[model samples]
Target chain A: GSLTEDGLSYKEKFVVRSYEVGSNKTATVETIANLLQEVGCNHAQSVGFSATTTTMRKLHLIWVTARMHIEIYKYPAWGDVVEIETWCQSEGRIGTRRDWILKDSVTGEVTGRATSKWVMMNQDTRRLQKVSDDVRDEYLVFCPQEPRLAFPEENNRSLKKIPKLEDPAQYSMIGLKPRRADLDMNQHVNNVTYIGWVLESIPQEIVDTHELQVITLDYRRECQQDDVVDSLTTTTSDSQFLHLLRLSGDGQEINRGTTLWRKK
Target chain B: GSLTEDGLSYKEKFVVRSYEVGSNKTATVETIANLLQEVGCNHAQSVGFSATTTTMRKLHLIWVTARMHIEIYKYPAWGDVVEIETWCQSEGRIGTRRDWILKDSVTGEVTGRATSKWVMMNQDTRRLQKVSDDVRDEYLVFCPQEPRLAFPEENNRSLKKIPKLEDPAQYSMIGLKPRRADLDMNQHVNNVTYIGWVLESIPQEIVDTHELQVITLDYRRECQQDDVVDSLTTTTSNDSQFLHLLRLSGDGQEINRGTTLWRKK
Candidate 1:
């Protein structure tokens, strides 16, 4: 029943848990990322896709996020039941993408939308792998002929890449380590944990008063269990906050992000 | 349908989420604590307890955990739907307690049990508040006449207190700061966050190879948003890991913990 008639889309309802709520008593941005991750994982499960746990064990391949963006017109408060509709599409031979539309389950009004680009990596070798045409042809039935792209303008040109940030940033938090709880089954820092660390690097006034309206991330590296990270954020005089996360030693980039916020 | 006929116990079903699973592909200790906190919070919502957001705003009161203990016989894997049954009881005039029994919903077998003691706190003053006799009498009909204490022997004596941990501890992690998401509606670090920090201070070998079976925590101080803290752990060789979290400014303790683990199968 959760799957649509085309068998290409999935919908799930989530009640904002108490701990998932932040100071504003609304579900935190990380919580929304987590909800997206969960629903995306479930959709892959239903379709027997490569992101499923079985894919890692049997196929020896796992999907990793290359880029993701979320835009929210409204944030759901704790106890609000929001539904998500998610679908995936293959991008030629190598890249695959997933998109989600968030809605108020009762009103059916859309609240937010998210889109992510995924690429396959060998579980043991940790090297990027290609999705051949035959494989996509077999499982591509799970993707609709008409896919919903959350950011339609990016349909031809990719989302603007977040440029590599340089030194002496306005705000920085050094020596950010992944807590034990931050690691997922893939043995890497969950994408949402990176979001949390980026938020930590921003200014306190922004943290206290503003709510994130738009968030975009481009992941360039995978974080290991013992890696020490440093996060940096810079302001553009407007609402755009550019962020960077890197390894502490050599400063190899982990990911870059852009977040737009509104005063609450 | 979730609450029992006695109207005292309430239950909820949780599907172990994909991200909640650890390297073992089973729900982590923190995930279970989050689920427990969710169901417990839901129970309070159903019963209109003071730990709720509504109560914090309207009544200017909230509940803080004094101590909690959990024992898990088995952990649920991702996609498993486990149900938790929880109930609360008043402890005299000041203390109140809650208990939960976790079950494998498909098989109907018990997997874990948890118990915790809660005390009232004032929102504005940030001091411990007494649960007046009148308040307990009126609202505590939500509690059962004969409460199920997960640790029955503690009916007389409290759960064994984790002794104050001092250096030279076997392991320690310092300069720990609560990520923004770690704070709850009450403006304090969520009780489960302290669990994650304790697990963080333990050795990587144990973190990689062991599964927690029993965990007991004593919250001595509330962690503020701007607080700098440290976590420490020491072992007793009997599968028990004693841990401590304290403020960096002083040697003031935030919480103490003792965890027992089973070497992974």
Candidate 2:
């Protein structure tokens, strides 16, 4: 594991589990999300900022994904080891940005890059809060003065608008019902689970022939337990596909995204 | 990781993950079962017996759990590391026995022990098969002769019969639905999931205060994906509890029977 000059960034290695792989024998998108989550939490804990410590002060970090762009050159198969380096940087007063660089452990070849934004929220008031001076001071005291983002500048650019599918005939849909195992501590479906549902809607042939290059997601709302979600996807071209997750009962959109894939 | 002189026994360390723990902040029984399954497969693979190798020749190792006995002195909490040692031995021409011993990584104190009996089934014929001399020869050629079980004198006793709950009023019930994730590669609910369901029926107060001592389960039939099963538990005494799993839609035919005992605090 490596850290940046500021001591805020950290890198970790993880071995892909047999259960984490998809039918294509590569790590599923959900497994990548899990690894990212583990690295994120591990980074915070190492920096003396843990969930328990923050929650004790009635302050919680609400990771609102403003934009996430994950470009994957290749997916590591089961039992293969991968290295992920993640770092957090202050975007401004309201948002904190995080970036990740994934690589194959044996070959050291870059496999993926991801970036996202998060904000803090008051646990009691349930409202977003600006990065408090005390909080900022605590983080900076541990880390060095300078900050760095791991991904390239162009990789951190704003995501393009993902157009909605107007015709039901143009897309394939899958019905999903969240179960007990799907619920996280927030009593809602974990955000990482949505990526799996989206992948479930993709055709097997497309999933086999292509590797995901870019994914842009907009989480519209949280889906609770017992809410049936319809995962709909439309392939606009040979390289692009648009996806939407809507409540099956009321047809309310839960999330919308687009994925760009390149032939393997 | 350690292996016995005969190379039949293997030991490995594992950290209890947050997702693998239950509400009590301790590793769930299902998680332990999952680790045991992983170790079992790894041991087989190390001994040159793999799933693909077995399946390629139309020979499948169908392990049917006839009886299982698990004794836990302490449950490792989340983030705590523990060591698990497992080994397999032949019982007779028809049965094979496996044993496990779990210890705390920091203190090196024995925390748990488990033993189970398995019978092989012919995958193609779907019938119980005897341990042929050829199959037995392959296993013995890898392992040393004269297999020995790894438990105390009293720990190797046969499991007692878990009587069914005659009256519904005497038992507590929890409705369970097998979802897509519950299904294993066999297209049915995994055996370990039933242990979690049984734990669900245990009172939260008891789960918090007392540590589990012994668990014995007899798997009767496989539960499919769409089946609605009911987990029922009846406390026979202050320290003893009986659990039974049955299909809720039918005449309540029992699919599993289990007995759990708790150590006095």
Candidate 3:
């Protein structure tokens, strides 16, 4: 049971609105960034004062390094409302572990569950500290003994083979620099701008090939401006393309995304 | 007038779309930054093979700073389309001036016009260079003097006073921090989250005090985690309380801003 602000229990929710297919999907790295920002902000709202909101002035929490894994059982369309239930599972000396259960709110279908470990710290001081008991208690109260879904442990999934292109193929890799204007309050690249990168990176030939229908992504890791990264893409056909973007350092695969273009 | 892909006498369109409003409206900094980036890329694209696009390796032009001042005659509403038009005015030794006319596409209202001075540079050495002739020519094709609106001059309007909370009334200054979750590919805070900051900054007391109506903000400059900043909110109460917020630099000077707030009781 949640504590009532005024006889009203504040409930935290996460919903898997609808699945995005084909070109609608983006690389996991970018997708995870968006999901975390979206879901983190969503989950934090229930608690009133997120660590970020509480001390917003300082941009204190600099590097939020966490170990996370996800499975895209179903993607979400732009407008569909995806249901997500988040709870402060536990807090320890290292960091806090939060669990999420995604469900289709309308159809009552449990989509999937995502678990991530987060640490709060002072960016200036760079010290990890425990979440305040008051905040922790308020968040935990929302999570009853409700059975949490199993977290996905498999990091390896079969590569969706890239089919050959029908028309003359074009290929190129674009390198982007992080500008101060593009940086957000967190001092990182804006999540939406990454999509702008994909849009800007579209080869001129492919630009005329098709129109984008939908896009979804599973963000695997966080990317920073300091590092050099590449947006790797190849057109499998006029309608489909296979892509996976990796960080420049040893080519760490950050995300795997595919775009489905339709001939107009 | 824009040159179509076919290089014909393309129809010129002057569109203005209302963007995010109130606390949600980011400073014109990003748009300014985007316009600069757009011009730089367009400059390269106008030429045969964009060397900057190639040498930079997959990345396009990045914005460094805005030496010019930005005016927000009217802040836009969230998701409102702002008609954005760009044309090259002239070129010079140190820099070049390109003018942008933004309007509300639906209502045919001029949102704001931003004129910027750009200096080309070698992305590798980060060296400032002159605007190339090839790049300049391509931009001229889009120049439409026939329908050109007079560009607003700097210091065009009087600077509005940054409001403060009334004497004896205590205001709240909240600090926000980004988590690992908040970082994006650029390893910085996401842009929309800043708007989210202003939205989250709205005190529950203020939300309860008034039927929060609408808001207007002119984003003056860019903000990043690199600079320590916070939201300062000043609320005025009568039948309904009007609250304004400013994302100030660590020293309390404005960086980005949220101007008017109307509460319907």
Candidate 4:
């Protein structure tokens, strides 16, 4: 993985591994999410802004994702190389936005696009923090002169906020717990695992006839090692569904999501 | 991933990705197993002898693992590249044995060794099949002409079968169901997912203080997407040893059993 000419964007090549492929021998949605995380971390490392680096750790701070939107057109098969291109831009006074484009290494065709929003948290106090001048200057050298949004202007303007669903009656799966494999270097459950739980609650009939096309997630809170989770979903339309992940003990929300599916 | 000498062996380079690392920034045990599986499948693809290849699929057959033994002396950290070398040999007329050696891509020093036993099954009939002459010839060319074992004779001879547990277990977790991500290309739960289920039932204290050093698995039956499972574990006389069992949610059918040996970190 290396930075592009302006030092604002990055290019990293990933091998769609054998185990990452599903029954169709193409990479799964979760695999795509993992690859996105991989390139993001690599970019963060180059700018000294990652969990493994000095700036955030010395300040007792950490970056947490707020929301993510992913739209895929095709999934690469086993042994194929997908070169991921990524860049980050400051969103507001307290937030940052990152975008990624997936391309085929052979023909250089675009395969998918993803964007995410993130905010900094004080690890000791667990409160969101505003960007300081000293902290901003350290990473500003790596940013572009102007924003290069991955999606069209109208697309971002028209993106709907996921509506909260009516509770107490719908498709649900409970008693889900975290495995040791779920934890990352920071020890919190990684964001990619939440996507799997959302789909786990889908009805068997939908799973048999439909495949996921687009997914959007909103992160609410962090989950620990022993926390038990419940996944709930409700039908929004013939091709779309609303999903939620919450703590089973006190009913605190973990994540809110919406998914669009296509008939197989 | 590519074939090695005489087309009888294989070599694959694995980059320890960021998500595959643990709190210590080293690769997790499950990551090692997955890397092993990756190289094995790539090797299987070369000789027309894998689940995705014509030889097995044309016969309406698939390969299944019976037992596996692994020991690791060191674990690679994130971004480290480790090259895995592997090969196959006959294990009697009915089974075959595959061996692997994990090496540091830079220094070429041996880091670990693993061996597993496999057999063929008829997918439609769901019954074990013997290695017929026609089936043997397809893959024999990719195997060693003579026996080549990864471990010493005494090590293999001293390997003990994991003892079955008694009627009652001290620690257990039930009602576990399979997620879509657990299934492989064949639509059956991949064998690596079972390793995670075994540790999920482990004692909390053991996981906090002790790191797993050795793992041995005895695969019994296949599990489907709809099948519910229970993971059960019991303490042996020694504090470092743990016995494991997994069965259908009904508790009447057995899935597989395993044993783990751990050491204080």
- Writing each residue's lDDT as its tens digit, candidate 3 over B1-265 gives 3434644222223111122112333333343334333443343344433323233344334323223323445545433455555554434345445555566677887655555445555544656655555555645554444433334446442233445434332444344443222333344454434544554445545543443333334444455544445665555544443444545546665555554344444
RMSD of every prediction: 2.9, 4.6, 17.1, 2.2
Query: Order the candidates by TM-score, highest first — what do you get?
Result: 4, 1, 2, 3
Q: In candidate 3, what fraction of native interface contacts survive?
A: 0.02
Docking tier of model 4: it is high
What's the true lDDT of residue A168 in model 1?
82
- What lDDT does each candidate get? 0.80, 0.69, 0.45, 0.82
- What are the iRMS values of all candidates? 1.0, 4.0, 11.8, 1.0
TM-score of every candidate's chain A = 0.92, 0.85, 0.50, 0.93
**Individual DockQ of the candidates?**
0.82, 0.20, 0.04, 0.81
Task: Judging by TM-score against the true structure, name the best candidate.
Answer: 4
**Any idea what lDDT model 1 has?**
0.80
Model 1: per-residue lDDT, tens digit, B1-265? 2677878889899889999998888999899999888888788778765454443456777677888788888899999999999988889877789888999999999999898888888867879978766667765678887757866873422477567666687888877778777888756777888888777777777767677787877877777777777887777663544555454535655545555444554
Query: How accurate locally is residue A174 in candidate 3, as Cα lDDT from 0 to 100?
Result: 42
Cα error of candidate 3 at position B255, Å: 32
lDDT score of residue A101 within candidate 2: 87
Write out fnat for all predictions, comma-separated. Answer: 0.93, 0.00, 0.02, 0.84
The residue-level lDDT of candidate 3 at B182 comes to 37
